Structure formats: C-alpha cells, structure tokens
Subunit: 119 residues, 4 copies
C-alpha cells in the first residue's frame, strides 16, 4: 500500500516503491526550500507490521543535491503509514544544513508533513 | 572520511560505506531498546559539501526489524559529518513506533547522538 | 488576542491570560495522557510582534503535577499565534519524563498541536 | 538543588529559583544568536519527583525580547534535572520564530543543551 505517488500539504511530491525486504526507493520533489527538480530518496519500513489497528513505521532521507542544485542539507522523515480507504503517511521531519562549528546550534529544523496517496 | 566503523555514546556501532553519488549503505547495532543484532541502514549525504568550513549534511534510516526481532518502529538520524583529526557525526534523531490512532500523539521519540570512530 | 480559551485537535483545553510584560499564565486540561483536572501553566510571548504578516512567537510549560496526580513529566509547547478572523496557535511540543540515567535516551516525546480559539 | 546559576556548552548562563510548588523563575543570558543581556524566563518542574533514581522533569520558556532587542522568537527547553556531585540539567529545545504563513514550515529549530553549575 506504501508504493505509489503521494503529496503533502505543501504541494510536494513523493514517488516511492516499497521493496519486499523493507527498502524504500524513489524520488522526491519539494514545493518549498532550496530545491529544483527531482532528488533521490532512500528509506526503510517495517515490512511485517502489527495487525491490530496500527500504522506501519517508516522513514526516509533525501540529500538536497541532484545534477541541478545543491543545498548542502539533508532531510529525514520519520512516521507511519496508515492504510485504508484514505491512505495517509503522518510524519515529523528534521532538516540539517552543513554548518561551521560555530553555527552548529542552529543547523536543524523540525516540522511535520502529512502525505496523501493519489488514487 | 565517512566510510568506516563508528560508535555513539550509548555503545551502538554504525558501519557505513559512502558511495560516490551520495548514497549511504550499511548496518547498525543498537546498545539500547528493543533490539538484537544488526539492522540494515540506508541514507544519503551531500557528496559535494561546501569548501568554507562546514560539516557534511547526511541522514539515514534504520527500520527496527531483522530476522530475530521486530520492534515495529524506525529511527532516522539527521546531522552532519565533521572531519579532521577527531572525526565526528553529530545528529538528532526521531524514533516513530507503529501505533493505533488513539496513541498516535505519543508515537515519536526525539534524541541526539554523537558518533566518533573511537 | 492570545488571552482566552483555546482547544486543540485532541480535545484538550488551554485557558491563558497574556500579560503586558510578555507573561502567559493560566491552566491546561489535557484530553490525553497521565493527567486529571487542571494544571498550572506559565509561559512567555513576544509582546511586540513584527507587523508584516507574521505570527507571534510564544511558548509555555506545564509540569504534570497538581493536587490530584503526578505524572513526573513536563511538556513545553513552542510555536506562534496567528491572529485573524480565525485565530490559531500552531505548535510543536516536547514531553520529557523523569527517567533513570539508563532510560534517559527515551525520556522525550515530540509532537505538534494546533489550537483553536473559542469565540 | 535546581536553584542556582547554571551554564551550558555554548557559554550561556541560566539563573533560576525553584519555588516550593513547582514554579521556575529567573533570567537567561544567551551566548549565541540574535541576543543581548538577560531575558526573563519562567517554567515549571515536578516538585515531587519519584524516589526510584529518576531525574526531575522540568521545562521553561524564554521569549527573546528585552529592553534592547527583539528577535521575535521564543525558545522552550524540556528536560530533567539530575542531582548528585556533578548536578546537570539535560534538555532538548525548540526555537520558534514568528513567520509569515509562507515560511511557517521553517519556523522551528531544534537542539539539545546540557547545563552544569561549572
Ligand atoms: O540550508 C539552510 O541553512 C536552510 C535554508 C532555508 C531552506 C532552504 N531549502 C533546503 O535546504 C532544501 C529544501 C527542503 C524542503 C523542506 S524538507 C521538510 C519540508 N517538507 C517538504 O516537502 N519541503 C520542506
Ligand atoms: O523505550 C521503549 O522500548 C518504548 C518506546 C518505543 C521505542 C521502541 N523501539 C525500539 O526500542 C527500537 C530500537 C531503538 C533504539 C534507539 S534509536 C535512537 C538511539 N540511538 C541508538 O543507538 N539506540 C537508540
Ligand atoms: O511518563 C512517560 O514515561 C510517558 C507515559 C505516556 C503518557 C503519559 N502522560 C503524561 O505524562 C502527561 C499527559 C501529557 C499530555 C500530552 S502533552 C502533549 C500532548 N498535547 C495534549 O494536549 N496532550 C498531550
Ligand atoms: O540563526 C539565526 O539567527 C536565524 C534563525 C532564527 C533564530 C532567531 N532567534 C534567536 O537567535 C534568539 C536567541 C536564541 C539562541 C538559542 S536558544 C537555543 C540555544 N541555547 C542557548 O543558550 N542559545 C541558543
């Protein structure tokens, strides 16, 4: 159910393929920030979820560098997939920028994104 | 400089290989929590950091399931690599557990880990 | 505009009074967790906001101990007030529990709450 | 044990008084960021921690505005006090800046600070 095209509240696009071994691979296109075009993403997910009523834990990373731009930063999203008629991935994320050692204290942003599956 | 064996402050070991295009691949062994043996890890890093003096942005994920246990959770570390004599990777992490909807508010833990090659 | 009664998506209630010196004082009643009745809250807010189109930065803390229960934990909410016809306080929070030194790594939860002002 | 003068790893000084019912009052002086002089701080702490061996839960807020500057932001630290010979306060913090709606996604920074009386 994870595999497919998803969009978040900002208009960003997340295209992912879930592998049988727990691997997530795909491309991400961000509606905001210092980004252009597609960026490679790689992640992991729990391929043997609990079967009560719980979500599937997962996470993925994107380094903001492709052939067109490099923002010297990486974002990791951690959250869970909640399947159903209306599938959603609720996340919390951390965006770290490469900084000198003096600005290190302000290298990391934190937010939350909710993704909606197309079709 | 990233490629290698790293250890954090809790006793975990992180073995990673950094590929030429920004890929991070390896295995993780946790010292705490519901965990036993190695777990596969994957991530990405800036394979062209700035030349000022800044660290190298990176991140990776470890889903806590292997052929022995499944804690139904995944951790993502976000931080930066800083080279030099005493190379370090400073990160902050988010641990999300699969939960029912009524427990989603307390699904995520947050912490910080410092990795060194010592 | 901050002063008043607010509710979040979980059904929790936040009654606050904003002082002229940047102080926030009031009571909080949580719909979830190890809590019962009212808990004292104290915080600070930027009493001289930018006047472009931006929110007002603020934060407050609640220690989960009152005369009825003690959860040995404290939550701090950090966010901004966005006034208007439909006033909202968008937050991110950290809940830390007192732990032994060995469980310290798992002492802190992180989430996000959106509050809606009544009337 | 909480009452006193504390310092973090960046050079900031935290002067607090802990009241009998759980109130935290004091002043903060930052060593980094847009900041100059002391800022008022208020918080709460568990005024009846458990007797096992656990730390004391606490939190406080500092709005970054005083009679000299206004960074239009507020930081909240959440963590715990651990007594003993080398008393420490370990925390994680969230720094939110007032933003326009189109910049709300990047309104909040997150970090961790360790305070000692040294
Ligand atoms: O590098 C700094 O110091 C930060 C500068 C401000 C933002 C610049 N942009 C970037 O670094 C890359 C864009 C990241 C986009 C973010 S990741 C979390 C959030 N979700 C989403 O779909 N888009 C945003
Ligand atoms: O504390 C508990 O066990 C209940 C809370 C839910 C978490 C359950 N999941 C786990 O314990 C999975 C293993 C995570 C261990 C973490 S990842 C962040 C930190 N760094 C490290 O090297 N080990 C710990
Ligand atoms: O103490 C632990 O180890 C955690 C145990 C699980 C939760 C127990 N509950 C508590 O500690 C106190 C309840 C806090 C309520 C939280 S604060 C953040 C969130 N917002 C809101 O309106 N309610 C919840
Ligand atoms: O890096 C910048 O200045 C742009 C990012 C927005 C933040 C603007 N606000 C400030 O700098 C206000 C002062 C915060 C300083 C922080 S609070 C967390 C950390 N601990 C400490 O003792 N000082 C720093």
């Amino acid at each position: 159910g994870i595999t497919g095209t998803w969009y978040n509240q900002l208009g960003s696009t997340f295209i992912v393929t879930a592998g049988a071994d727990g691997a997530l691979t795909g491309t991400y296109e961000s509606a905001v920030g210092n980004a252009e075009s597609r960026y490679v993403l790689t992640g992991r997910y729990d391929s043997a979820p609990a079967t009560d009523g719980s979500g599937t834990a997962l996470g993925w990373t994107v380094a903001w560098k492709n052939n067109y731009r490099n923002a010297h930063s990486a974002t990791t999203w951690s959250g869970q997939y909640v399947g159903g008629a209306e599938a959603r991935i609720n996340t919390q994320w951390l965006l770290t920028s490469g900084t000198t050692e003096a600005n290190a204290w302000k290298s990391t942003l934190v937010g939350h994104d909710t993704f909606t599956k197309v079709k």
